[model samples]
Target: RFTERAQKVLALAQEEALRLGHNNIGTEHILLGLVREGEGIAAKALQALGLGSEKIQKEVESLIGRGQEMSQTIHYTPRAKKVIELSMDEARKLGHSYVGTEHILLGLIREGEGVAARVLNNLGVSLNKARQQVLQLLGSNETGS
Candidate 1:
């Protein structure tokens, strides 16, 4: 089960792929989606790390140049699929019943070799740092309420 924000991220991922003329959804697109969603812990963590959608978009464009417009339906890349699977695992590990943007962000980091991870690494955001950031945000919410 995916949270509304997670669903929106996935949908935005597809849109990002299409906007870039990419024929398939990839980790980079998913990362873009997270940043664009802008309302989840994942987005907050990334923002705390000084990342933004426009910054990530430029990095993705530099990494993978635009392609021809896609007419057929796009599909997820193998790595992207793996990231999805990992997202479920991340949710489970955190005792969450549903997958959310934070889980997806953890999945991207765990996947580790996809374009999204590379982008993160290049931007100086490590897995441990990201995890800490997410936990910190989650902690803040609980303390607030």
Candidate 2:
């Protein structure tokens, strides 16, 4: 289950992939979307970890480039799909029924393989730290998306 904001992030992920002229929306795009969403707890946690959207965008763009033209329809890559599934699992583990940006970040971290994870690790974003920040922001152990 996903909250409204989580749904927004998903849409943004696709937009990012198209904007970047990528045919597939990978975990990196999802992460970029989260960073760009800029209002969810996911973005807050990322900022707390010192990963700004502009900085993350540059880092991601360096690894990839724009294509000849934006894709007509961008589909999620297998790894990106796995992260969404993992986000559900992460929500379960955290005792939450709804998926949120934090859960998505957890999924990205837990998936542990993909440009998202590599970029996160390179930028010093640990799962534990993200969880902590999320929990701190939510201020509860049993509540939050």
Candidate 3:
């Protein structure tokens, strides 16, 4: 259902929360992971929009403060769940049966109701622009092109 990179994004999201001593994995953390992934379509799209890991980290810290220590059991926030759910929809809309980081990025923008979207918007990223980048990178994924 998901690509290996997508899985890494999830794992990295949790890691990001833990690194920041957050008890829960939120959309902001998930977005941070996507940017940190750094070699995938989603990452490229973010970079194209002038976003980098350093800037993303700063934005995340400003929007969500760090905690004192890592929690024993990190959990996903409701907004993070929504982003995951929306990622599935993004996959379907793109005619992809498998979820990928690009889809996750699509989810972030489509959800557009979370801190992830806010942070991205603040960096001048828009939904439609992101879609084009994803599609461009996924051109090779097309079946009958």
Candidate 4:
């Protein structure tokens, strides 16, 4: 689902964040960086949604963006931990032996009624569409494909 470019987005962001000594992995600014990668799925997704990486990057450059702003919760609670671990459970349910970014997106949709889901809905990225996008991108499982 990521295609190589999409994977690069996550890799660069994660690496930069770690190098910058940030702990939290859910910042819009960090994501905004990967978006600036210009060829990643995140950038493409944002582009598809009409959000330009340069736009957010400008905010970061101007000190308007929340730079290195850490969340209050460093670790997750039981439920939150489960959410973070969702990739495994989701892949297992899908009868897949390995995990990928697509599986994570699927997990988000299935349990996505939370803030992320609602926000995506407002952006016209419904769970159904997300699921369909994954299936359409990857096609069906080996049982059919």
Please write out the lDDT profile of model 1 over residues 36-58, one tens digit for every residue: 99898788878877998789988
TM-scores for every candidate against the unseen true structure: 0.90, 0.87, 0.87, 0.49
Error of 3 at 56 (Å): 0.4
lDDT of 2 by residue, 27-71 (tens): 999999889999987887789779899988988888777776888
Order of all candidates by TM-score, from best down to worst? 1, 2, 3, 4
Off by over 4 Å in 3: 136-145
| Pairs that collide, model 2 | none
The top-ranked prediction according to lDDT is 1
Q: What's the C-alpha lDDT at position 7 in model 1?
A: 95
**Per-candidate local distance difference test:** 0.86, 0.84, 0.84, 0.48
Model 3: lowest-lDDT 10 consecutive positions: 136-145
Model 1, position 65: C-alpha lDDT score: 84
- State model 1's lDDT: 0.86
Which candidate number would show the highest TM-score if scored against the true structure? 1
What is candidate 3's lDDT per residue for 11-91, written digit by digit as tens?
Answer: 899999999998889999889989998877788777877889999999889888888777677999998999999999988
Superposed Cα deviation of residue 105, candidate 2 (Å): 0.7
lDDT computed for candidate 4: 0.48
33-99, model 4: which lDDT tens digit per residue? 4456676433545565555666554443343324355434332234333443675576677666655
- Give me the displacement of residue 49 in model 2, in angstroms: 0.5
**Per-prediction RMSD in angstroms?**
2.3, 2.2, 2.6, 6.4
